[PDB]
Design a protein that fits this description.
The structure is a homodimer. Chain A is an alpha/beta fold. The first copy, chain A, has helices at 20-26, 49-52, 66-73, 93-107, 124-127, 150-164, 188-201, 212-216, 224-236, 255-266, 282-285, 290-300, 307-310, 313-319, 330-334, 343-356; strands at 8-13, 37-43, 57-60, 81-84, 116-120, 168-174, 177-178, 206-207, 222-223, 243-247, 270-271. Chain A has one domain: Rossmann fold (3-Layer(aba) Sandwich), CATH 3.40.50.720. Helices cover 39% and strands 13% of the residues of chain A. Chains A, B: One of its GO terms (biological process) is monoterpenoid biosynthetic process.
Amino acid sequence: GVCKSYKSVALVVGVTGIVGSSLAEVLKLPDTPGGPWKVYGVARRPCPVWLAKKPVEYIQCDVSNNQETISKLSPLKDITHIFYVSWIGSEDCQTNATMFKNILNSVIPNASNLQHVCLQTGIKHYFGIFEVPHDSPFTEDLPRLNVPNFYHDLEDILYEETGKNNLTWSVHRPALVFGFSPCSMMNIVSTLCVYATICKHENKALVYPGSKNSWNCYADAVDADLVAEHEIWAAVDPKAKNQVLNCNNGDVFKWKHIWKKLAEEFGIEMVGYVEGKEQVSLAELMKDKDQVWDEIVKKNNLVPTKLKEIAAFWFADIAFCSENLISSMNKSKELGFLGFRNSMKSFVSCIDKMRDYRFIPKAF
Amino acid sequence: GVCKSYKSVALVVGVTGIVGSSLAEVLKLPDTPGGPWKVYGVARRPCPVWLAKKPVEYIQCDVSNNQETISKLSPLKDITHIFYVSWIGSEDCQTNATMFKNILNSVIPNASNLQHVCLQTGIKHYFGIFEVPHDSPFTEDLPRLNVPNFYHDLEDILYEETGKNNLTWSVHRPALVFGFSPCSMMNIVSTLCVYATICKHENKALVYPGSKNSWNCYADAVDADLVAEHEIWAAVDPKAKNQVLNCNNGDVFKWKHIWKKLAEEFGIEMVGYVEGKEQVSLAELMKDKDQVWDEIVKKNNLVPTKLKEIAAFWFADIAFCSENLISSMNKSKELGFLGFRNSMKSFVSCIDKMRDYRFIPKAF
Ligand SMILES: NC(=O)c1ccc[n+]([C@@H]2O[C@H](COP(=O)([O-])OP(=O)(O)OC[C@H]3O[C@@H](n4cnc5c(N)ncnc54)[C@H](OP(=O)(O)O)[C@@H]3O)[C@@H](O)[C@H]2O)c1
Ligand SMILES: NC(=O)c1ccc[n+]([C@@H]2O[C@H](COP(=O)([O-])OP(=O)(O)OC[C@H]3O[C@@H](n4cnc5c(N)ncnc54)[C@H](OP(=O)(O)O)[C@@H]3O)[C@@H](O)[C@H]2O)c1
Ligand SMILES: O=C(O)COCCOCCO
Ligand SMILES: O=C(O)COCCOCCO
């Protein structure tokens, strides 16, 4: 029969990532703006089984290799929108820049109907890198800090390449992401579910390892599905074009309240913040747990994951010494994007979803 | 000619108040839900000139007097919606309760097409009175505190009288209100504009008198027009009926940032929070300034106001020792109300509006 017709064709670079995996779902929903969408999903690893059960055309490609990327993406003549939702896993400015340049150099000369490039960075734009920050609430008019942030390099490539080629652009700066991918290098919900699961397995309480300040302060986050919706909005709506845009759930929460919910969701005792205690390292608490995780996977018949891949304990340790990082959604709301989530409900939805996918044990 | 036709008829109780004055405007806009609206506006004082220039039918009535209230409101047979946006100016539970009972007892037996009662209370529901608070973000499922809050008494009357008479109800709990009325007993924007104006008049800097914590913490507020919109939404939309609902602008701000903007708006030097200083009383700083204000009114040809009526320095002193009071808008958003304001823009809009109305001097 005949070749299928699509209104829009997405290239999702980082399709196994915390946002890319949500784009793989949201782009294929019937009422999604710009649909019907065809989705090409790029990542470096072989396609996981969980993603092979989705109507996404997977392209295995190391996007840090220019020749390989040209070979794999230059045939894709029908792309209309690029969603760059990847990073190399370190803060190296040049390796990250190379990945994004390779996508653009392979696609721009070959996709005659290309319209738009979405670049995903983050709120680290406002306060620095992990290796003086702005005061908050963070707004998109704040200037770059004088530090070597790879986000700066990615933006500079975006502006140059889109300007030369009459393409529109958007920069998306999500808050901390609440999502479900077990292949992410920075997935807080999965990290905390894994910790809770190990505590439950060992008959131990859910002990909060963080700082006092992070227990009590206001924090914010963004559901991965909302980031997907926001990127799609900017890809399709002329009002959003050529803009830098924050993305968060629209509300605030406290880790104190999340912690209680996490313990309830796993049916275990909570030990909250104890007055006078200093933060301890969750990465250190978990450093010898690789074989315990392997045993838990086997006992619960989970999708097989390596502990350091499903969990990022180092990233929880950063979250638990952070404060004063709230970002503003006013610019997006003023431009007409009114999407939101209840963050407490979002956190629980992500636990539910990871259980459905068999990444984390069911409640017992 | 013929009697005019209206779709809805509002009784705004407290029409000179910080929210009632905004209802007097929003209800008469062409695209307001439930329109066209007829507006009866009730307050105790003689109608101010500023309000007489609006298409509102003013009813001067002391609503604490039952016989008087019956006499003045029982003839109003066409009322469809009540907006109770008043309080007596003290925390006395019985005088406040009497005012609201008198409205209901005068209207319910006489307005055959009455549909709905909107009751405005506030976030003090969650943390106590001015004479242990809940942790935040505050949500509408939080139980009453064991304290004598007149809000409890008002709610109890609302539920009883609406239930007996097959009426719908809503309870609105606004955050700190950003508005323009110079007749309010609690108008923070006007209070701070008056302080700034006195500082400017005396060739003094805009000295922040508050606490460290209130300078740096996250705070929230609500534009009076947004409270009006929210009350009207609940009055007209079946989804919102019989609900307790918070109302805020949807974002957060810091007083540190507001203070800089206030100084810029008045063209004067800012002295922000100074490390190590304790809060001082703005009420004490201003206690002898009544005649200075009279002179400023005369010199700038302002609408004549008494200092203690246009400004509430005591209320600024409470704002400047408050922290941890953020409220959630998730319930309203989940029920479909997506109204919002940028709080920094709202604050400036209120300064602009008070200058337009000649309550506060123009920029010079
Ligand atoms: N996660 C958060 O909470 C968060 C919050 C705010 C902002 N951000 C920012 O969002 C951006 C994207 O990160 P993310 O967290 O969404 O990523 P992520 O969940 O860690 O996913 C990374 C994705 O990039 C792919 N990738 C990495 N190296 C690749 C290569 N050489 N070739 C092809 N694919 C490659 C990965 O696939 P493979 O594993 O196969 O390589 C995976 O699909 C970053 O700038 C990050 O700082 C993240
Ligand atoms: N202002 C805020 O920032 C704020 C924030 C959150 C919640 N709230 C709550 O909102 C509710 C309403 O207060 P508000 O601040 O909107 O009020 P407001 O600005 O102080 O206005 C009070 C109104 O009530 C009228 N009033 C008072 N006593 C009256 C009487 N005996 N007879 C007739 N009218 C009378 C006043 O008219 P006259 O002067 O003529 O008497 C005025 O119109 C209160 O429960 C308050 O705590 C206020
Ligand atoms: O937003 C980004 O640029 C990366 O995520 C930062 C998370 O914020 C620190 C606490 O985890
Ligand atoms: O919300 C209410 O019930 C009354 O206003 C409270 C203002 O909050 C304290 C700091 O000003």
